[PDB]
Amino acid sequence: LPPGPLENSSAKLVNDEAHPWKPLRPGDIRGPCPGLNTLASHGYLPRNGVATPAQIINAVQEGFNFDNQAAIFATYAAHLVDGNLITDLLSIGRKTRLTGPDPPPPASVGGLNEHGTFEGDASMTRGDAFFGNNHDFNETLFEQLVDYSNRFGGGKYNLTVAGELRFKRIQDSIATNPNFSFVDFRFFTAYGETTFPANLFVDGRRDDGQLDMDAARSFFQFSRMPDDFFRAPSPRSGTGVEVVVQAHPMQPGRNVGKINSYTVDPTSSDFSTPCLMYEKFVNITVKSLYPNPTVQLRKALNTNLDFLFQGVAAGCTQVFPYG
Numbered sequence: 001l002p003p004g005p006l007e008n009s010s011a012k013l014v015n016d017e018a019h020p021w022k023p024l025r026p027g028d029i030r031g032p033c034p035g036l037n038t039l040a041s042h043g044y045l046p047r048n049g050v051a052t053p054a055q056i057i058n059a060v061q062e063g064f065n066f067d068n069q070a071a072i073f074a075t076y077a078a079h080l081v082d083g084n085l086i087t088d089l090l091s092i093g094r095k096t097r098l099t100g101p102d103p104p105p106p107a108s109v110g111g112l113n114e115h116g117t118f119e120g121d122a123s124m125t126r127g128d129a130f131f132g133n134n135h136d137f138n139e140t141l142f143e144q145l146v147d148y149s150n151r152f153g154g155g156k157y158n159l160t161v162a163g164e165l166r167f168k169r170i171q172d173s174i175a176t177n178p179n180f181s182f183v184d185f186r187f188f189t190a191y192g193e194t195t196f197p198a199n200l201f202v203d204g205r206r207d208d209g210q211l212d213m214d215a216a217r218s219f220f221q222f223s224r225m226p227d228d229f230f231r232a233p234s235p236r237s238g239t240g241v242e243v244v245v246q247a248h249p250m251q252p253g254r255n256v257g258k259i260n261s262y263t264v265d266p267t268s269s270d271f272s273t274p275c276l277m278y279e280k281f282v283n284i285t286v287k288s289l290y291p292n293p294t295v296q297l298r299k300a301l302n303t304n305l306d307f308l309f310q311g312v313a314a315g316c317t318q319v320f321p322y323g
């Protein structure tokens with residue numbers, strides 16, 4: 001079952017003796033999410049980068065104080081499109097045999113590195129998949145985050161910096177990635193993720209939304225908590241996303257096979273239709289990976305879809321693609 005919220009959500013030392021940072025061993029998997037990467041590299045998750053949904057939810061709550069609803073939605077969304085529903089295992093990065101025997105095509109079980117399922121374009125510190133690598137830390141892009149932090153954050157990353165950098169990344173992808181896609185689930189996650197460094201990488205004794213560049217580099221590049229790192233003092237995820245959107249409001253869309261051809265998709269959900277984002281994720285994304293599942297895969301799908309729905313905000317109607 002999905003874990004429930006923390007019994008004690010106060011700030012505390014999370015870079016503690018039981019969770020030391022260690023470097024990667026051969027075969028250890030890290031991916032496009034610096035949160036999950038850091039949790040693996042401190043042993044909140046298995047250090048090889050392969051984990052169950054329940055392990056992921058427990059780790060994001062205990063290590064960073066990610067809120068329960070957000071943890072459940074993100075984890076089950078990722079597992080449904082990128083994980084192995086029979087073995088209950090998800091890679092936090094590249095596709096691996098460690099998640100078990102694969103289901104039939106068209107399901108990919110490609111881990112979090114799979115482009116266009118959860119991962120997508122205009123990431124802050126990772127390049128678009130079209131440019132060859134959607135998962136490793138990118139120094140040029142991080143130096144641009146440092147530059148935007150120096151320009152709009154007084155040297156720190158905050159929500160003002162997030163608003164400017166989010167737009168700059170979208171504009172850069174429009175100008176250079178002929179396959180740029182910015183609709184539905186990615187449209188939502190691309191905005192929320194820009195608040196996470198300000199809300200979750202800032203030491204919880206301060207919780208001031210001002211992330212220093214030493215801490216930023218430690219998390220984004222080395223999957224490493226600063227020495228003496230205290231997690232946030234309460235559960236949260238995307239608080240302040242409205243500031244990022246307000247800086248440069250965008251409509252969902254995509255380049256249409258050429259640079260500078262950004263075309264709005266009226267069938268995409270946006271922030272006016274959050275329930276549509278969930279319904280399309282299940283009815284289109286999940287169903288297309290598993291269009292005619294066998295009995296045991298259907299059961300695992302329905303269970304994980306029920307868990308996903310627990311992370312949906314109230315007032316949406318649950319949808320049942322397999323009955």
Ligand code: HEM
Pocket residue numbers: 032033034035036056057060064066070071072074075078112118119120121122123124125126189193194196197200201
């Ligand atoms: C709850 C389970 C979570 C899952 C399944 C998840 C998964 C992902 C994935 C697949 C991406 C890549 C999206 C992209 O940029 O293309 C991503 C990005 C990101 N995640 Fe997570 N994540 C989770 C929780 C967290 C937590 C707890 C943090 C912070 C402590 C975090 C911070 C980030 C950040 C900052 C990015 C954007 C990286 C960038 O744009 O350079 N995530 N996540």
Ligand SMILES: *[C@@H]1O[C@H](CO)[C@@H](O)[C@H](O)[C@H]1NC(C)=O
Pocket residue numbers: 127138139140141
């Ligand atoms: C990192 O991003 C820059 C800027 O988009 C790109 O030119 C470069 O090829 C990427 N990869 C690296 C530095 O490995």
Ligand SMILES: *[C@@H]1O[C@H](CO)[C@@H](O)[C@H](O)[C@H]1NC(C)=O
Pocket residue numbers: 152153154158159160161209
């Ligand atoms: C970011 O920092 C700059 C400089 O200190 C400040 O002007 C701006 O208000 C800050 N924004 C937030 C949301 O803290």
Ligand SMILES: *[C@@H]1O[C@H](CO)[C@@H](O)[C@H](O)[C@H]1NC(C)=O
Pocket residue numbers: 276279280283319320321
């Ligand atoms: C999803 O499918 C359900 C039927 O299972 C239907 O009621 C709903 O309107 C569909 N939503 C979308 C956005 O396709």
Ligand SMILES: [Mg+2]
Pocket residue numbers: 032119120121122123126127128134
């Ligand atoms: Mg990406």
